[PDB]
């Protein structure tokens, strides 16, 4: 069940970095947030989609450096 903690942490990491992509719109941040999201377990299949969808949206807005 350290494996519950891992999965829980991947989720926070992804939440945190996606929130931060939304803040800077950089290629650097995009890369962090996209990997983080792809790392989240199908266990959270739902919040994974919402974060991915959130990423795609920052991409629609456009990147800046």
């Amino acid at each position: 069940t350290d494996a519950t903690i891992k999965k829980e942490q991947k989720l926070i990491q992804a939440q945190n970095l996606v929130r931060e992509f939304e803040k800077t719109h950089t290629v650097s941040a995009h890369r962090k947030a996209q990997k983080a999201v792809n790392l989240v377990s199908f266990e959270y299949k739902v919040k994974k989609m919402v974060l991915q969808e959130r990423i795609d949206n920052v991409l629609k807005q456009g990147l800046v450096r």
Partner: peptide, 10 residues
């Protein structure tokens, strides 16, 4: 490509 686009782990 995990850094670039949605990639399904499964």
């Amino acid at each position: 490509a995990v850094n670039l686009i949605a990639i399904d782990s499964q």
